């Protein structure tokens, strides 16, 4: 988005820290081109005198202003996608009770017991549990108060800027391209999923190419369902975005909120409002307090769903801005935030769609970086969706999500202290699809030290997961 003012005022929100990711026995064997993100601007592994603060907020290239005709076109696409969205999800999007906002309904998970509470609770030294009874289902003093100022449109807040402690490619580590989380006040998170909770729960339960959303999916079992759908089509695309979150223009954001979350579709009048507050945000980064117009905080509730909805409207917007009489059945797509797989029997030129995405402020490149030219003919077994490649299993005949061996080496090479064993179990579920031999090599440094699930114990489990009959029939 557009940074309207940089200001150093009063307080200093300490976000500087050391990584708790420690190298494992795997790191010495594999030596990945991967390492923990730079969480302090004085990291020795940083490139020549490059300031970490400088790069972090440099994603804000501005707020792209759309013309009255581009706005009217985006509105039509937003109304058309929302028509499809609410036709298959229903209009049971009534406000979620204080209880259901905490505990979560069927589809929507419970709110996190104790994560970062946001502001001004961090400038007070207290937890999520010190504000809300997560065991009960209701809140505390200031939260039921904040509930009512949100109810009365009065509420104003500030986003707390966190540093993402994660493994990243060493090039991005050296460049200091550490990703950031914008932790919003816990009452905002609570009230957002009060307004759009049942909708988000419906989104998860109905995930698939029909709604154009992979949010709520189980890649272990849903890869078979997704893989067969996209195999039918002539051309498949692997689209890539440059800072997808920060580049959502205020015009596109406001219109989407106006068209999808209408009171006509069963939403509370404050469903449109609470999401509109995400347009113009205040960011607390240590001594700095920066106001940002446009883009969306990467860490709010339903952040993956909002970006999915936007990604769906973008593709429809761009195609209609180029081709004649483009409808929703002209193509098919599934998206998770910025991750996206497009398919059509038509030979669509995505090399020509570049500037039509630039009218939104988004830059589309092919994920397959080769010559960076959107080529035709690509199949389902070419794309990378959710870091997972689509592969036909030679044993059962079903699609399986395979991660690149270099990526799986990176996950295993770094882990927080005293978590190795549980992470080895968790990553083993991801690594089982790479084959019996690769599974052996990936876990070779861990033998005699930790419990490694036998390749067969995870394969036989996976077969029962994809189809309950598939294991019984064999």
């Amino acid at each position: 988005g557009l940074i309207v003012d940089t200001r150093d005022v009063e307080e200093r929100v300490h976000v500087m820290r050391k990584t708790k990711l420690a190298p494992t026995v795997a790191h010495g064997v594999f030596n990945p081109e991967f390492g923990p993100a730079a969480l302090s601007n004085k990291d020795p592994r940083l490139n020549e005198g490059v300031v970490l603060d400088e790069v972090i907020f440099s994603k804000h290239k501005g707020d792209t202003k759309m013309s009255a005709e581009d706005k009217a076109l985006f509105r039509r696409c937003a109304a058309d996608y929302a028509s499809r969205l609410h036709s298959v999800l229903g209009t049971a999007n009534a406000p979620l009770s204080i209880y259901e906002a905490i505990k979560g309904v069927d589809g929507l998970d419970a709110m996190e017991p104790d994560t970062a509470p946001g502001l001004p609770w961090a400038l007070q030294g207290k937890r999520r549990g010190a504000l809300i009874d997560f065991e009960n289902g209701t809140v505390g003093p200031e939260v039921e108060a904040a509930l009512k100022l949100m109810e009365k449109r009065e509420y104003k807040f500030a986003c707390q800027t966190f540093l993402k402690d994660e493994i990243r490619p060493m090039e991005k580590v050296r460049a200091g391209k550490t990703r950031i989380v914008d932790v919003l006040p816990v009452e905002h998170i609570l009230y957002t999923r009060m307004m759009i909770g049942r909708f988000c729960a419906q989104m998860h339960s109905n995930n698939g190419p029909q709604i154009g959303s992979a949010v709520g999916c189980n890649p272990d079992v849903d890869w078979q369902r997704f893989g067969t759908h996209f195999a039918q089509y002539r051309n498949v695309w692997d689209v890539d975005y440059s800072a997808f979150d920060a580049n959502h223009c205020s015009d596109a954001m406001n219109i989407m909120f106006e068209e999808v979350f209408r009171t006509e579709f069963g939403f509370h009048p404050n469903a449109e409002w609470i999401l509109k507050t995400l347009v113009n945000t205040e960011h607390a980064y240590e001594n700095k307090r920066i106001t940002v117009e446009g883009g969306m905080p990467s860490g709010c509730s339903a952040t993956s769903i909002i970006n999915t909805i936007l990604n769906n409207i973008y593709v429809l917007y761009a195609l209609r801005r180029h081709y004649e009489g483009v409808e929703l059945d002209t193509y098919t797509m599934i998206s998770y935030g910025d991750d996206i797989v497009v398919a059509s029997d038509y030979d669509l030129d995505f090399e020509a769609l570049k500037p039509h995405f630039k009218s939104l402020g988004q830059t589309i490149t092919p994920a397959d970086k080769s010559d960076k030219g959107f080529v035709l003919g690509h199949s389902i077994t070419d794309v990378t969706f959710l870091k997972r490649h689509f592969h036909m299993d030679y044993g059962t005949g079903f699609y399986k999500p395979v991660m690149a061996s270099k990526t799986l080496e990176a996950i295993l090479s770094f882990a927080r202290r005293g978590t190795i064993q549980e992470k080895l179990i968790s990553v083993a579920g991801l690594a089982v699809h790479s084959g019996p031999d690769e599974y052996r090599r990936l876990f070779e440094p861990f033998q005699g030290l930790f419990e490694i699930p036998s390749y067969r114990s995870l394969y036989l489990r996976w077969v029962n997961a994809v189809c309950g009959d598939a294991a019984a029939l064999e």
């Binding site: 991967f34 998970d109 994660e166 493994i167 990243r168 490619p169 090039e171 991005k172 391209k177 990703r179 998860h204 709520g216 999916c217 189980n218 890649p219 890539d240 975005y241 440059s242 800072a243 993956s304 998770y336 910025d338 490149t365 994920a367 970086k369 959710l386 870091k387 997972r388 690149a404 270099k406 990526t407 990176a410 996950i411 991801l430």
Partner: peptide, 15 residues
């Protein structure tokens, strides 16, 4: 590779 990184996130967590 642009901003799109190879190893970071799958999903949010388990359903």
């Amino acid at each position: 590779g642009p901003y799109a990184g190879p190893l970071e996130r799958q999903r949010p967590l388990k359903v």
